[PDB]
Point group: D3
Chain length 240, copies 6
């Protein structure tokens, strides 16, 4: 039985997303967030398995949805959310690697801006350097929420790469030299889309892996890190 599609990639009806949305790469993690932290929750997207849900957190409307892997994937989903679904604030909630010697596995990283090896931002600004920059109120809400929860955080730059399986000599050394704290694949695509729509975005990630030492969080450590990060993000939404 055919259903009307408000976008090519999302089964939700217009209005079915809250103005504030958390997004993570793995749709199964979106379901875990909804099941464990949202009330009044309903599934609003099933297309491509990219599960999305709308409910409330402490009474305030909040949605959560997967975004898939990479800049092109998050760009589709976020463009649609801001444009068709009229979302105002997206916080990406993710995992990351690090090269910074002072950032450790299990650390929580709040992203102020994200570099990239993608061409998508050059294309938006006449070939020039367009910093993918988080909204300050979002960053501050995340920082303040972690402080109130007594959870330490690292605040600074991420790097969003198109290539998970890097073969690039000298990259890690440059990222470390300039104190990039988080290596991931999506945030640099999100922030300029928020800008286009006059909207807001941020990102918070937990360090799953040290790219230099190959230290890696166990499943139990990843659950603890997730619980800390998601509580920070959820509490931050109450201020946004």
């Amino acid at each position: 039985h055919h259903h009307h599609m408000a976008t090519p990639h999302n089964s939700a009806k217009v209005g079915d997303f809250a103005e504030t949305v958390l997004m993570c790469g793995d749709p199964l993690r979106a379901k875990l967030i909804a099941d464990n932290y949202l009330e009044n929750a309903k599934q609003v997207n099933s297309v491509r398995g990219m599960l999305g849900f709308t409910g409330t957190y402490k009474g305030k409307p909040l949605s959560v949805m997967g975004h898939g892997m990479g800049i092109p994937s998050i760009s589709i989903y976020a463009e649609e959310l801001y444009n068709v679904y009229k979302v105002k604030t997206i916080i990406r909630v993710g995992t990351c690697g690090t090269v910074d010697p002072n950032v450790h596995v299990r650390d929580v990283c709040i992203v102020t801006a994200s570099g990239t090896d993608s061409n998508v931002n050059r294309m938006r600004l006449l070939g020039h350097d367009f910093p993918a920059t988080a909204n300050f109120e979002v960053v501050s809400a995340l920082v303040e929420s972690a402080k109130a929860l007594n959870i330490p955080t690292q605040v600074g730059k991420a790097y969003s790469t198109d290539i998970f399986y890097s073969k690039e000599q000298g990259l890690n050394e440059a990222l470390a030299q300039y104190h990039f704290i988080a290596v991931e694949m999506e945030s640099a695509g999100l922030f300029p889309i928020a800008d286009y729509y006059g909207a807001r975005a941020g990102c918070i990630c937990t360090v799953s892996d040290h790219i230099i030492t190959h230290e890696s969080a166990t499943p139990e450590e990843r659950q603890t890190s997730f619980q800390n990060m998601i509580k920070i993000a959820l509490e931050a939404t109450l201020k946004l």
Copy 2:
């Protein structure tokens, strides 16, 4: 209950993929392919909802798995398939748009090479132009299979973009001027990875939308197009 992970993105054990794999963006379409065309089928990946299956087509081992949207996503999955899972041949089976006035909605397009606005291939070849090129035996198997099935095809170049929601003036005119037949988002990332591993890849797509006229296949027309394309691809695997 924790399971050992052969890669960060795939629950399959080494050996659980056939040497030949069909891949499509939508994991739910991978399941439809498995359910309707594979025998001896078992689900071998569930991670991130990116369903993958292994069975046989007319007795020959064949797998099918989703790849998600965009070059970064297919690059993760294909790198792992060629490297860890020792796959020899991947055929991307997809949908596409067209700008070419002689290509029509519902047409089947067999891709010989794919352009891109991604930087991933420049990075592989010292900043130069590296054509993402299908393997000739794969292209020929697709062409010959369609001929034997009496299904007309268009053969030629695709363009793989990082940006589904294009705002780029003059792009469609240039794509049409040079007779790019298919606009999609992934094939240009697949072909160089096959090259790295000394392996093979190709792509076949059906035209869902005319980018100029906004003609668009209905659900029923998309099913008919899918049935034609998938039969071509499946028959081609018998020759590869």
Copy 3:
């Protein structure tokens, strides 16, 4: 009479700069800041007329120095300050233009990150996009200081151009589309140098000119704007 030179561009002896420095393009403005807001002040640089001073603001060590016009100029002075003079925090205090329809002449802009048409940041990060990003503690100190002073601010992205006399079609439209709030010439060169040295930087500017309407602050309006901005910056230094 020859004097020993700790750098090719600065007559100050090692140790003659405080750990916190305000910098503005015009050295004559640096002198005005020193004369009107610093105590215990002494001139520490005269080379190239690029006046610099060290004293205290409300008892805390603080220096102020001109940086000249453009990324190459500020890069020389800031590299030397962080490297030879062991400075920990630099706040650029400047004027800017705007294209944003919601930013007005006389507004105070606090910069979170800065785009650029310079190549200097690509060169630092293997040709990729390296966002010139302000330190969050610096941004927050500026925001909080303005709040305590009851001075409204705009917070967001700047754009640092190499070309004051732009001839570039479409630039202003793109800057406005993505809500760049400030157009200036230096901040994108400062922030990556701070990163290299594990140090901190930020920027606050007042809008002197609307690039679209050609509204322009009179001398009296520029003095009032300067007084507001400099008080914000000086109070912020007490927290840094």
Copy 4:
């Protein structure tokens, strides 16, 4: 005595070229091809010594002409052939080097697409990656002709460089990593011009030199290789 010039570079009258043309870099080789394989042959171009001839091969109209060395040179001649002379199919017949460990001196290489260090294709596609791609019917005609003649072939990517005397570190390693089979200087300029005119092109080359081992075909070996390649190309024209 002045003659009317249909183009600045070609003395042929409109209509004096067949719809199918073989082109090689060396005009003296074009004359050898005409003298040894064409009947009904006449010289149709003498300008700049760039000898061109029109006749028949096994009764079918066929021309042969030199194209000179490099992308800019072949671009002039091919643009004119497709535009003014209304040619439909050009097959470049050439020599090449190789780095691929599985490609040997004297091998025959049929080109499916060609990379390049030239900027000419970026200029055609808004700065993006435009694969210089051979027409599939041309490739297939070459492959099938070699099979019928029992001459082994290698099929795959070429690389067309602007710089015969390379000084570029890491280039050969990257070409080998991605299984580029032929290194030459022209094909990447030909294929996009064919596309512009809605026409067809391909390339077949013989390996004269191994770039790694410095193995090099003797004059006698080059004649044998030429005889094999040219027979393949000539027989392929009967199918095009």
Copy 5:
């Protein structure tokens, strides 16, 4: 009968070129120069029809040889001349177009530097801007020779394009805005090669065509222009 080849593209024996060489695109023009202006002349290259000759002009050793069309072609020939044949000075003698409103058809242009759309000079200087610059003594010898002959000249920048058949919007306007006096295809490739070898190069061209007005020199006018330019070049060689 096989002859030893000192380079892959030139039949001349080492020592068979004078230290000073004139080069033009058309080998048939090289022969005209030799036949009409050199004494003691012998043909020293026949390979690829790229005629080259060595003799004397007013008793001083001088060679003349064709270079073909485009940067890749002249780069082969000039690299070999400077490296294997130990040439010290090359003057390119050519024809050109113009867009400059103050440059007229039949004018003689002496080139001080040449821009380009080729990538070959970026590759030599770490991706940066490397001006293809004529040697000052060569430029001055050409200027002084024309003065002594009472032949007016234009002195300034050329632009060497890879694409004779330009489709590029805005190019002519930019070339005119910045007073590029000559449009041709080779000089920007010559000057950096001279630099590599610690040698000298220059270029003098006659305007055959006005790109804006389509004014075009007749055959008789081209002969008169050639006679003026070649006399200037030949007299300049006596000073070099």
Copy 6:
């Protein structure tokens, strides 16, 4: 007391600059030039401490003004001089480093063209290579003046970098390979601006430092070098 400003960066009234201007980076050096070599001198600019003066040298009108450090700085000042102040000729008089083994500390270098790592010239010429080229009459006047004064000179290419504190591996080797004689920071920005206005520019510099050996001129040696260079420049102005 407010004064009318003919430009945002210069207090001079229209007409207060001579048609010929010498410019150096350090405004204090501009004052030394005025005080020691100009008659009828008056200070015409004080803005930003960027001292400028107008008087006569041997009776002919001549101005001298500082330009600050880097391409963006000189671009502001030179654009204004050519556009608002109607200047016809600017000679940059500066200091430089060298890597060339045949160029020595204290040598005088006359610049024919300047490379750069800036993007400002690509932006002027559709992204292509635009050589920043000195006017030939200016170069020749400098060469002839030095000859008449019996002061040896080196003539050739400069390189204008945005980054005084280079971290770039391989740069010095490439500059030496291609015989760049002078390393500085401004000339590549000046020459294209002169071109835009149909005006003239050149540059002469003295070598203060050998970048390889770290040989460095003492204060006394810098004064002697300055005296030689400035006399050459001043005498050249009499011919321009």
